[PDB]
Amino acid sequence: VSSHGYRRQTRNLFSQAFRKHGMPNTSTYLTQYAVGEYVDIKVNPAIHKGMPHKYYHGRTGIIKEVNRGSVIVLFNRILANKTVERKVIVGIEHIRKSKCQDEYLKRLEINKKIIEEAEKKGEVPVLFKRQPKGPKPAVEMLMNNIIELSYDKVES
Amino acid sequence: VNIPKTRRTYCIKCAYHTEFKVGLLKKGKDSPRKQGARRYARKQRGVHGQTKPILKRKAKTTKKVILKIECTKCKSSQLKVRGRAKHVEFGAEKKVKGEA
RNA sequence: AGUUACGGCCAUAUCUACUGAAAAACACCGGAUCCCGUCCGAUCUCCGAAGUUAAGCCAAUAAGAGCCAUGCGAGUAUUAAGGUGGGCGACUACUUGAGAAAGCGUGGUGCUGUAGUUU
RNA sequence: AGGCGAGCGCCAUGAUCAUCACGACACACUUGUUUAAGGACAAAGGCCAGAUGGGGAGUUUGGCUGGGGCGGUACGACCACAGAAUCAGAACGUGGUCGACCGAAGGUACUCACAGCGAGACGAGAACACUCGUGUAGAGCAUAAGGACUAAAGAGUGCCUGAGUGUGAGCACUACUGCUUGCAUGAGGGGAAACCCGGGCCUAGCGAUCCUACGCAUACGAGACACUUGUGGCGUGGGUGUCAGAAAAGUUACCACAGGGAUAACUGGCUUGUGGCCGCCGAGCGUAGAAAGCGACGCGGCUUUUUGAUUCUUCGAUGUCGGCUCUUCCUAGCAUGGCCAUGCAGCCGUGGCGAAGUGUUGGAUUGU
RNA sequence: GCUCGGUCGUGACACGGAGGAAAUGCCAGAAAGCACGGGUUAACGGCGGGAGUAACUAUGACUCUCUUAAGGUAGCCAAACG
RNA sequence: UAGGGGCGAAAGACCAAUCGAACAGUCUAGUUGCUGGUUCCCUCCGAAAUGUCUAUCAGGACAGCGCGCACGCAGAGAGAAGCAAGGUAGAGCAUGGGCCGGUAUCCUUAAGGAGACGGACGAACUGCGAAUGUGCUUUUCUUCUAUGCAAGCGUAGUGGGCGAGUUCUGGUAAGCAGGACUGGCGAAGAGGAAUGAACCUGGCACUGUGCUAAGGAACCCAAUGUCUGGACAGAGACCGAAAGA
RNA sequence: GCAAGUUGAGCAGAGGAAGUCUGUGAGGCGUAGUGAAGACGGAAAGCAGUGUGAGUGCGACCCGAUAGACUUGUGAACUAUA
RNA sequence: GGUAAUGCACAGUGAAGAGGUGGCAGUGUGCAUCUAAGACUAAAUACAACAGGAGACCGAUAGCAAAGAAGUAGGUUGACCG
Ligand SMILES: [K+]
Ligand SMILES: [K+]
Ligand SMILES: [K+]
Ligand SMILES: [K+]
Ligand SMILES: [K+]
Ligand SMILES: [K+]
Ligand SMILES: [K+]
Ligand SMILES: [K+]
Ligand SMILES: [K+]
Ligand SMILES: [K+]
Ligand SMILES: [K+]
Ligand SMILES: [K+]
Ligand SMILES: [K+]
Ligand SMILES: [K+]
Ligand SMILES: [K+]
Ligand SMILES: [K+]
Ligand SMILES: [K+]
Ligand SMILES: [K+]
Ligand SMILES: [K+]
Ligand SMILES: [K+]
Ligand SMILES: [K+]
Ligand SMILES: [K+]
Ligand SMILES: [K+]
Ligand SMILES: [K+]
Ligand SMILES: [K+]
Ligand SMILES: [K+]
Ligand SMILES: [K+]
Ligand SMILES: [K+]
Ligand SMILES: [K+]
Ligand SMILES: [K+]
Ligand SMILES: [K+]
Ligand SMILES: [K+]
Ligand SMILES: [K+]
Ligand SMILES: [K+]
Ligand SMILES: [K+]
Ligand SMILES: [K+]
Ligand SMILES: [K+]
Ligand SMILES: [K+]
Ligand SMILES: [K+]
Ligand SMILES: [K+]
Ligand SMILES: [K+]
Ligand SMILES: [Mg+2]
Ligand SMILES: [Mg+2]
Ligand SMILES: [Mg+2]
Ligand SMILES: [Mg+2]
Ligand SMILES: [Mg+2]
Ligand SMILES: [Mg+2]
Ligand SMILES: [Mg+2]
Ligand SMILES: [Mg+2]
Ligand SMILES: [Mg+2]
Ligand SMILES: [Mg+2]
Ligand SMILES: [Mg+2]
Ligand SMILES: [Mg+2]
Ligand SMILES: [Mg+2]
Ligand SMILES: [Mg+2]
Ligand SMILES: [Mg+2]
Ligand SMILES: [Mg+2]
Ligand SMILES: [Mg+2]
Ligand SMILES: [Mg+2]
Ligand SMILES: [Mg+2]
Ligand SMILES: [Mg+2]
Ligand SMILES: [Mg+2]
Ligand SMILES: [Mg+2]
Ligand SMILES: [Mg+2]
Ligand SMILES: [Mg+2]
Ligand SMILES: [Mg+2]
Ligand SMILES: [Mg+2]
Ligand SMILES: [Mg+2]
Ligand SMILES: [Mg+2]
Ligand SMILES: [Mg+2]
Ligand SMILES: [Mg+2]
Ligand SMILES: [Mg+2]
Ligand SMILES: [Mg+2]
Ligand SMILES: [Zn+2]
């Protein structure tokens, strides 16, 4: 039978990668955080204070409050077939800034131009949506340089 | 476990750090005049047998170390709790490193 | 263009042999009276310029070891979905999709930020 | 009121109230010695208190479990493995550990490594102390297992008792418990300072209501007022290991009741280890010679006639071992009929093939 | 287990003592029992292991060693008891 | 001589067909987590056999899944497009464990040992690493959507499950014991596999005409014939191994 | 139905009467909370009925133990012993 | 219910003439309110047999066990049963 301590089953998780042992780099400490940013959790096994519980490893959430050397992040979780919000305390050594909003922020920068012109000249924005890839395109071909294919390889 | 007989620490009444005297807490004698003692005496009185349960299936070996510390200036007291230990000594000789 | 002080990413920067280097630096170097520290002015701390490019730091060289990239291995190994497919089983063919690794070939061998100094 | 030893205790005897034996009388009480004998003793009653007490009275005698019992603890905690690469995830599944220990093995600041290997240095050897060069951990880190750590978290050296005090918010399926983190304070610590510290490098070493002991200030107190006892509030200790927590020994073949095929003792079904029977290969043996007859070391099957393994059907009932009697079926063929091989001269045999028509007995010991 | 003897200790309530305004507590005191010393199995019951050693071999009268409250005598037996 | 009492040449025997504690009557309609039963029609919606704690294991409670009444309302059991985490299958044998053999060379012996290398390996070995599955953002992103969702309040049943396909652990195995994922039977009829809870086709108000599925088409039995190769065994259509001519 | 309020308490007065009508008039809950308490104070329509679903206690959906106790109740015509 | 004694008893002990009580043990002191250890008392309240009047009750397997010669016919050794 299995046990139920705070760091159960973390032999693979919570171990350093090959040729990457030691303390964190300066960039870790010089990064500034703000309320409302999206942030991503990855535990560093060498630091023993401010570690989250291993369920949260590799998950992304939103910063709710900022303190001297730690952050409070909001998560959601299913328990007993219902949704529950959870507020997780994490030290700054175990977090990295998330990339999940990157494309959306670029798109907002384009929208922000159009939405002004749409008051002056038009009435409503064109709004620049994405579209999924359509059907295969048409082609005009010169028809020299033909290559033949054959079952010449007998494959003993 | 070895404990020194003196400890400089914060005194709540004096509101600054002071010298304290350190010793093991002592369990005092039960009083017949309290409400629980009075109730039990009356209930036991007749031909009623044993009227309250007594524990028999006991299981623990140690009990928790508890220190009483007294402020030398104002005689106020604080209670400090230290966990379970089979044996305790006050003011013995230091555990000097690198013995023969 | 190098160097030097403080750095960033942490081997394209490592490890082993050899060889070069104008100027200014960087060093080795000469002492212990004091401050400071040793079994020991070796290390650490202080006060100095008689010497020297031999060393370190910097740079080149090597069908070098190791690291980094790419091609091939290879539509190979494994795998999702499907059928009144096959086989006594062990397991395996086909149809619509996803898709490696080791080895071995070829090329590389630090890049940059802020300030100071030197034709 | 006397006496002793450098007014003290010790030794003399004289007044004041109970009081334990012993005598001698008769009045309570006792006995058909009764116009009598005993006698304040006995014997007989009453109220409290100790002792003894299966002679009796009430009651109890945990759970999980390839049925129960005996055994173990899968009953409270911790690490690793597996459970078809998030997390979770059963079995009396696998390898183990816990109920503690430590004034430093706690807190801080600085210095320097280690295990080994190759050269050296009298006694001095395999193994004594001191040196030089290499050395990504091959060492250590009190105590399982995993993770972590290199101008350190390891080994030394200095100083300190933060193993402070109030009061908030959260994480682990979250009550208890453990940990993370906010603000305010200390005539707080260590460090030049930035920084760090409200136990142990991280994941284990633990416990409610009521009662009781101690610490802390603020309350209550019966018509009024004072004091000795008492009652409230917050926090810690004293303990429940069956660990979300009753106060508890057996036996019934003299036995009762409610139920159960949720579960055993027959048969049947599935399986075939064990039991029995058959094939394949050819090392050696047979007077020569693998194979007339055998056939090691290995390998593949069939049967249900042995005993296991499991619990699907029956507990408002399927009569349980052996013998007697009587019938039918199977073949893996003991005799009787036809044949083939031979290490078949003849006699007696041995190995094989088609074949189940007819036969296969009488007794002694023993329930068999 | 039953029985006999003494106290050296413990062991109730009463009866005393000290103190306090008083209650509650405290101290002394204390029979029988218990403890301690003897008796008792036609009372309940109980009654051992290991090594060597004799002119063939076997066996061990003999020796040594551990052990106890005492180590199964006289008889009887694969017996209704192997 | 009378019931927690009698009487016994002792068997728990006997005490009015009753005795290991008599009979009569009352308290009393004693108690029951256990067995049996529980009475009219149609319409609409529709489960669970799992988790935590329990002197708990034939029982409870709390939560999860139904239904009724519903304030209200931009959502979704599906994809894309950016982004994270993971150590299984395959592949390998660089730290640790561990099997067999080595040329030149080296060390001694005149044996053996070491070896520049090759072959064989681990659920508690890893240097590399899938497919499938999981989460985050964006409708400023395709596609659907009111006969739809639905906070809140009140209250039920359930808490013995079993089986198929794909996979795993214990065991020689088992119609054996125990988990995970996606649909079933339970609570599911109809047509087909001759028959069968779960397999194939495919989800049911009540009628009438046409068409197809799965499976069939000499006869039983509604619909059948054709072409080309194999095969002779009381064979096959239903059916066992290593070994063989 | 009435509403910062609400109500068939008991009981009295009327009435050819176990009905009905009218008084007097308590109490209860509400009109705002916090603490063990001393003490302090700052949001949210209620009361009484007529019925339905549902919890708890009483025989409690219906039937069913082996047992326990109590009597100033009965029995030795069978059977035991003097 | 009565909580460091609400009421009632038994044994020891046992008052004062002045005493009792004021929902928590004790001691003191003012204040308020009563008078135990002797007796009698109407009305307003409770409920069988027997008699009278009523009813959203039951209608001969119902309603009391019993709508007729019902505690009857009949039964237990007996208590009792029907
Ligand atoms: K006389
Ligand atoms: K006389
Ligand atoms: K006389
Ligand atoms: K008894
Ligand atoms: K089992
Ligand atoms: K275990
Ligand atoms: K360790
Ligand atoms: K009072
Ligand atoms: K009063
Ligand atoms: K108290
Ligand atoms: K306790
Ligand atoms: K328990
Ligand atoms: K018993
Ligand atoms: K008997
Ligand atoms: K059996
Ligand atoms: K049965
Ligand atoms: K029989
Ligand atoms: K024959
Ligand atoms: K025959
Ligand atoms: K003998
Ligand atoms: K014998
Ligand atoms: K007799
Ligand atoms: K009998
Ligand atoms: K009786
Ligand atoms: K039950
Ligand atoms: K439906
Ligand atoms: K259960
Ligand atoms: K519920
Ligand atoms: K390996
Ligand atoms: K593996
Ligand atoms: K329920
Ligand atoms: K069912
Ligand atoms: K269904
Ligand atoms: K059919
Ligand atoms: K079947
Ligand atoms: K036909
Ligand atoms: K009810
Ligand atoms: K009954
Ligand atoms: K009177
Ligand atoms: K009748
Ligand atoms: K009669
Ligand atoms: Mg897991
Ligand atoms: Mg008493
Ligand atoms: Mg120069
Ligand atoms: Mg000097
Ligand atoms: Mg020098
Ligand atoms: Mg030079
Ligand atoms: Mg059991
Ligand atoms: Mg430490
Ligand atoms: Mg801390
Ligand atoms: Mg810590
Ligand atoms: Mg428990
Ligand atoms: Mg069964
Ligand atoms: Mg077999
Ligand atoms: Mg059989
Ligand atoms: Mg029968
Ligand atoms: Mg039957
Ligand atoms: Mg029969
Ligand atoms: Mg035959
Ligand atoms: Mg015999
Ligand atoms: Mg279940
Ligand atoms: Mg049942
Ligand atoms: Mg593999
Ligand atoms: Mg179950
Ligand atoms: Mg069907
Ligand atoms: Mg009320
Ligand atoms: Mg208000
Ligand atoms: Mg009933
Ligand atoms: Mg009883
Ligand atoms: Mg009172
Ligand atoms: Mg009629
Ligand atoms: Mg009648
Ligand atoms: Mg008669
Ligand atoms: Zn003080």
Residue B41 DSSP label: H
Instruction: Spell out the long-range contacts of A135-143 with Cβ–Cβ below 8 A and sequence spacing 24 or more.
Output: none
B42 touches strand H (CB under 7 A): yes
Q: Which residues contact B78 (CB under 8 A, 6 or more apart)?
A: B12, B20, B68, B69
- What are the tokens at A117? 């012109």
> Which residues of B belong to the annotated binding site?
11, 14, 71, 74
Any strand D atom closer than 7 Å to B66 CB: yes
Residue type at B99 in one-letter notation? E
A106 touches strand D (CB under 7 A): no
Residue A9 labeled ligand binder: yes
B77 touches strand D (CB under 7 A): yes
Is the Cβ–Cβ distance between B88 and B65 less than 8 Å?
yes
Exposed/middle/buried for residue A155 (C-beta within 10 Å: 0-12, 13-18, 19+) = exposed
Nucleotides on chain F within 7 angstroms of protein Cβ? 63-65, 79-87, 126-128, 135-138, 140-142
Give the nucleotide nearest to A24 (CA→C1'): C10
**Solving technique for this entry?**
cryo-EM
Resolution attained, angstroms: 2.8
Cα A8 to ligand 37 centre (Å): 51
